[PDB]
Amino acid sequence: AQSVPWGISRVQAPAAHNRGLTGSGVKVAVLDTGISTHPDLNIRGGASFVPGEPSTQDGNGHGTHVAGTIAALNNSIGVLGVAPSAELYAVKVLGASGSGSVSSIAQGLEWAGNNGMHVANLSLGSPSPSATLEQAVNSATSRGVLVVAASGNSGAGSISYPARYANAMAVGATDQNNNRASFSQYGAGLDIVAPGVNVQSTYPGSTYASCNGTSMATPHVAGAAALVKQKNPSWSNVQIRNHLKNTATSLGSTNLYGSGLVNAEAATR
Ligand SMILES: *Cc1ccc(-c2ccc(C)cn2)nc1
Numbered sequence: 001a002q003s004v005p006w007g008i009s010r011v012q013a014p015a016a017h018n019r020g021l022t023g024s025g026v027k028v029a030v031l032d033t034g035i036s037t038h039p040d041l042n043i044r045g046g047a048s049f050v051p052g053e054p055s056t057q058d059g060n061g062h063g064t065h066v067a068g069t070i071a072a073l074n075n076s077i078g079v080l081g082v083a084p085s086a087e088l089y090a091v092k093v094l095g096a097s098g099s100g101s102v103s104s105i106a107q108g109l110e111w112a113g114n115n116g117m118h119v120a121n122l123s124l125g126s127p128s129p130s131a132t133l134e135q136a137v138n139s140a141t142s143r144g145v146l147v148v149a150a151s152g153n154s155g156a157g158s159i160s161y162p163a164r165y166a167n168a169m170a171v172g173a174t175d176q177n178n179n180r181a182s183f184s185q186y187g188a189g190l191d192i193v194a195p196g197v198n199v200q201s202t203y204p205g206s207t208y209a210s211c212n213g214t215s216m217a218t219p220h221v222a223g224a225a226a227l228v229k230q231k232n233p234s235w236s237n238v239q240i241r242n243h244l245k246n247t248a249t250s251l252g253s254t255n256l257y258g259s260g261l262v263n264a265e266a267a268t269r
């Protein structure tokens with residue numbers, strides 16, 4: 001039996017699916033701890049930039065969880081992603097510890113721009129800027145990648161890098177009441193929000209687990225971007241980002257929420 005995590009319903013992905021929009025033909029890179037083989041995921045390819053972890057399999061869990069929110073398969077098992085037919089790529093930039101470097105992350109972004117990715121999900125960040133990372137965000141953007149990044153979990157009224165950069169789409173987290181999750185960073189540069197509390201997704205060991213974080217919000221938006229791209233194949237990264245923002249539901253505060261709650265039904269109408 002398959003069940004639909006609450007956040008998938010909250011972003012109105014099933015309405016898009018009913019219109020035949022699933023993310024088919026859209027390439028989405030998950031720049032994370034890897035993605036493990038799982039019966040509810042279809043991993044097309046990828047690369048590792050973590051020395052000593054030459055495989056793209058996930059030794060942490062976080063990247064597999066993020067991947068399932070984007071693209072868990074629509075079938076009779078497990079869960080269901082926002083964009084269940086997205087073409088998923090495992091771009092390992094963080095090790096099994098959950099840590100990486102700005103160089104590794106930059107290499108993953110360069111890979112995304114050299115391999116035709118439409119969307120890159122970066123459920124990662126840090127309070128400090130990085131020239132290395134910024135250059136790579138800008139380069140990937142110039143190659144047509146929509147970079148979607150988590151605002152961070154410190155609870156502060158400023159957001160992490162790379163989400164803070166103009167060429168990243170910064171995603172904060174909401175709860176079941178459509179309030180900002182207490183940990184979700186907000187403020188200048190925040191673009192949009194999505195569910196990030198009690199998010200069930202795929203997890204290594206061929207199982208499922210629930211997590212909290214702006215890391216869980218981000219892939220809802222990455223998946224929504226893939227739905228928009230399937231509907232509008234000619235559109236650029238900027239056009240997709242703008243349309244997601246323009247069709248988001250206001251949550252009553254730009255400071256806190258950016259454009260508001262992503263809405264895949266309104267974005268694919
Ligand atoms: C510091 C830290 C620890 C754990 C995580 C995490 C693990 C697993 C899942 C599903 C979500 N988040 N993030 C940051």
Ligand SMILES: [Ca+2]
Nearest residue numbers: 073077078079
């Ligand atoms: Ca499934």
